[PDB]
Design an enzyme around this catalytic site. Structure first.
Site, mmCIF file in Angstrom:
data_model
loop_
_atom_site.group_PDB
_atom_site.id
_atom_site.type_symbol
_atom_site.label_atom_id
_atom_site.label_comp_id
_atom_site.label_asym_id
_atom_site.label_seq_id
_atom_site.Cartn_x
_atom_site.Cartn_y
_atom_site.Cartn_z
ATOM 1 N NE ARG B 256 -3.392 0.759 2.821
ATOM 2 C CZ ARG B 256 -4.421 1.401 2.243
ATOM 3 N NH1 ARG B 256 -5.193 0.819 1.324
ATOM 4 N NH2 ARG B 256 -4.610 2.694 2.540
ATOM 5 N NE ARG B 271 -2.626 4.664 8.935
ATOM 6 C CZ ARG B 271 -3.820 4.862 8.390
ATOM 7 N NH1 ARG B 271 -3.956 5.190 7.100
ATOM 8 N NH2 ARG B 271 -4.890 4.652 9.141
ATOM 9 C CD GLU B 345 -11.063 -0.910 8.550
ATOM 10 O OE1 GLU B 345 -11.367 0.252 8.255
ATOM 11 O OE2 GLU B 345 -10.614 -1.734 7.742
ATOM 12 C CB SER B 348 -14.465 -3.453 5.322
ATOM 13 O OG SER B 348 -13.540 -2.536 5.848
ATOM 14 N NE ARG B 386 -4.520 -1.663 11.246
ATOM 15 C CZ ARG B 386 -5.255 -0.626 10.836
ATOM 16 N NH1 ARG B 386 -6.589 -0.622 10.966
ATOM 17 N NH2 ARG B 386 -4.648 0.423 10.292
#
Lengths: 372, 421
Positions: B256, B271, B345, B348, B386
């Site tokens: 990412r 992140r 989070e 999703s 994470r």
RNA sequence: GAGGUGCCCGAGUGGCUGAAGGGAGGUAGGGGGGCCUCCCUCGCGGGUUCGAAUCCCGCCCUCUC
């Protein structure tokens, strides 16, 4: 890199070395510039200096590829009572691979399905567990790093063309974890009591596939992105030290293969097939039934202080002398190549494949079942 | 991409969608260009029907007629070419506009941006610590599981783990694949790069293009989710009804750019640029009945995974202006991170009806023999590093060591993570 | 250099073919107009020609030295 001091002090060793290794360098032009650097000369000399090779160990066969000497071979081919199918036809027969990926991602790509996917993650974990019983420290690492790490190992400049660059970034995708592992201690003076550092690093691995054949590349053999577990040792500067670590690396790789239950053999690699900074290289190769021949699955290498002088890897010797250290590396296991040999060598009458005893734990089943 | 006929006859639905999902599109110019392109197509079919009578009558025509016919077939060809180039320029431009049109959200979604998000359910609570809790990177430094020097080698938002924790990371990825495989899903291992078209086919292009790193000198891009590969496998193909649904669990490394997150999550595992992710992807027949059955199954599996992992979580319905351009419905699952005093989070669930099926051209043939666009949905199964930040903090013991949940003691083979150096 | 054709294998190098012949009477997708009727698609795009599945160019995937 090589010590400029004994380079100009012993230029024949290097001329002979460049000879037997087939490097494109006229040592006399470089030797001229290191006289003139007593402005421009400075940097012009550096790019040239980074191309000087390490002298090969005296036991190496001189010659290119075809001077490579079989050392020994362990195990013998399989006894089949049916014609062995090849790895690709076994996969295709069982729904263990997805052909449509060449449309999504292009050529020389692979996607595994059903029990072969769970097998692939199983062998990687088994490799890291084994290195960890064996005293090597486990690391999970990134597959990207800055330019100075590639120079550090010697992958740049000789193999720049084999490496993918991430656009709009100062980063490159690594072809092996030794790139990262090598650069970790750059600039430290390590304590003598820390030595030897034994690392087993895992990371995704990427290659441009500049080195390409129009032969068995297909299937699981030369793909652009794959999974590697690498062994790396940083040791004190003595050949007795280095030879002991080279020996360790080799037993490790042979033990995994004994546990995996594959026929293999060891090959002394010739000076012309070694690559510039090597002192010694042995290859382990495993027998591929369908091709009827032995294919590389591991390359053990000692480079002494050649890359420690590029990456600035140093230690403090017991007299209080600060010295460059010696480095070595060998594959522990890499997927999917190893799967092509595992599947052909272990196929059953009915096209299903059996699981070596040592992996029944990681898999939960004894035979790999078909899918769709 | 949306049904152009529906767009022609219900423009108000679309128009509301644009405003309520915050998309910057001028639907009345698109509607206009659409009237132009569709007329110029009818002109050109006039010219081509002519060329097709003349070219058929050159044989059979007397060497008299035959030479007249060829001068005509020739002028008609040059006209059609003129018309084709002109239609190329307009269709091209219309396709750019049409790849921005949003799917109208389901009616029960919160209208508003981020802040309009409603917590739906929470299972489990914040832990009651008898001692001061440590933060997850300090916990990592104390047990010697963190390699800080990786930042001089690869730069920021980078990590490397040492010892039991590196092994932990790998044991968690097989745990999730295993769970998924006994839940009826097909395990797959997959590449992390693909061609532009696949990015276009999920909806990651045009909108999230800045999120994706390109591989210089190639026609390739690195994916941030195994969804890009998975979605694209069946493009073009007409799937048989009896094959439906297609349930895939795909593992792949994810990368990412994390362009835009400046000042956000700068230290730790939260992140990073590159990580490991296992995905739930389903392709189903075109009925809301079938879709809603699948969305429930995807949520359930992820929840089950968080219970085995012994973690406090909550589901959160996402608002229209936060779900993104092609979603019918999206529910997030967030887990509690002690050091932050917040849920953060981890998964999703998103239903996207047929919006990515008709970008990727994913069709099936129903029981009546009609070919029609399919329905797709997706949700995370597990993504590293994470959850390791949440597992370490939520399971720290007072002496600094970290406990492993019961469901993963068969993968670690020990109950408390041992420290390195 | 050899290939890419319908569900699948395969025939077809200028009009006859959206399409031969077999297994796993019939067995494609999309778009205009009024069940009929027209245009486009033989891996993707473009081109020569009255006319292209057929010929040319570029690209993508398979196979060989």
């Amino acid at each position: 890199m090589v010590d400029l001091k004994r380079l100009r002090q012993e230029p024949e060793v290097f001329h002979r070395a460049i000879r037997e290794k087939g490097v494109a360098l006229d040592l006399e032009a470089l030797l001229a510039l290191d006289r003139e650097v007593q402005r421009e000369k400075e940097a012009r000399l550096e790019a040239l200096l980074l191309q000087v090779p390490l002298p090969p160990w005296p036991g190496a066969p001189v010659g290119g590829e075809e001077a490579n000497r079989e050392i020994k071979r362990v195990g013998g081919p399989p006894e089949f009572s049916f014609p062995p199918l090849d790895h690709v036809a076994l996969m295709e027969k069982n729904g263990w691979w997805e052909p449509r990926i060449s449309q999504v991602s292009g050529s020389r790509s692979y996607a595994l399905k059903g029990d072969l996917a769970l097998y692939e993650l199983a062998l990687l974990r088994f490799a890291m567990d084994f290195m960890a019983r064996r005293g090597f420290l486990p690391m999970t690492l990134p597959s990207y790093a800055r330019e100075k790490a590639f120079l550090g190992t010697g992958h740049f400049p000789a193999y720049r063309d084999q490496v993918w660059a991430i656009a709009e970034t100062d980063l490159y995708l690594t072809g092996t974890a030794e790139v990262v592992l090598n650069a970790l201690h750059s600039g430290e003076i390590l304590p003598y009591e820390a030595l030897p550092l034994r690392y087993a690093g895992y990371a995704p691995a990427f290659r441009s596939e500049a080195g390409s054949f129009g032969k068995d590349v297909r299937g699981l053999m030369r793909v652009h992105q794959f999974h590697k577990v690498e062994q790396y040792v940083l040791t004190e500067a003595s050949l007795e030290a280095s030879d002991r670590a080279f020996q360790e690396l080799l037993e490790n790789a042979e033990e995994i293969l004994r546990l995996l239950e594959l026929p293999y053999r060891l090959v002394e690699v010739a000076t012309g097939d070694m690559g510039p900074g090597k002192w010694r290289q042995v290859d382990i190769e495993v027998y591929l039934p369908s091709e009827g021949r032995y294919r590389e699955t591991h390359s053990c290498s000692a480079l002494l202080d050649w890359q420690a002088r590029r990456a600035n890897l140093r230690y403090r010797d017991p007299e209080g002398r600060v010295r460059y250290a010696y480095t070595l590396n060998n594959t522990a296991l890499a997927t999917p190549r190893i799967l092509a040999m595992l599947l052909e060598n272990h196929q059953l009458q009915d096209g299903r494949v059996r699981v070596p005893q040592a992996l029944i734990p990681y898999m939960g089943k004894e035979v790999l079942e078909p899918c769709g």
